[PDB]
């Protein structure tokens, strides 16, 4: 999925926020890895994607 850049820290266990509460929640004991990187040239057009 894709989110805003300022919410990359929000994707983590023991987090609090909008997308955590109302878009996607991770478990506290989550084991694994997370990758996030600007997709401007992919999911950002000047007209707004």
């Amino acid at each position: 999925f894709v989110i805003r850049g300022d919410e990359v820290r929000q994707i983590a266990p023991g987090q609090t926020g909008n997308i955590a509460d109302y878009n996607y929640k991770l478990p506290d004991d989550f084991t694994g890895c997370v990758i996030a990187w600007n997709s401007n040239k992919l999911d950002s057009k000047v007209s707004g994607n």
Binding site: P13, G14, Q15, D28
Partner: protein, 49 residues
């Protein structure tokens, strides 16, 4: 006259009071209140705390 009986009771009461009063020491942690720890420390950190 009979301090040799009284000292036993003194030692036991003193030991119990020390034991209960030890409930307030933080052991260097955030607090000695489990609810306070759970509230302030995110679950990942709260586990170790």
């Amino acid at each position: 006259a009979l301090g040799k009986l009284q000292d036993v009771v003194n030692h036991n009461a003193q030991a119990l009071n020390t034991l209960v009063k030890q409930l307030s020491s933080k052991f260097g942690a955030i607090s000695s209140v489990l609810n306070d720890i759970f509230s302030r420390l995110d679950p990942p950190e709260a586990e170790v705390q």
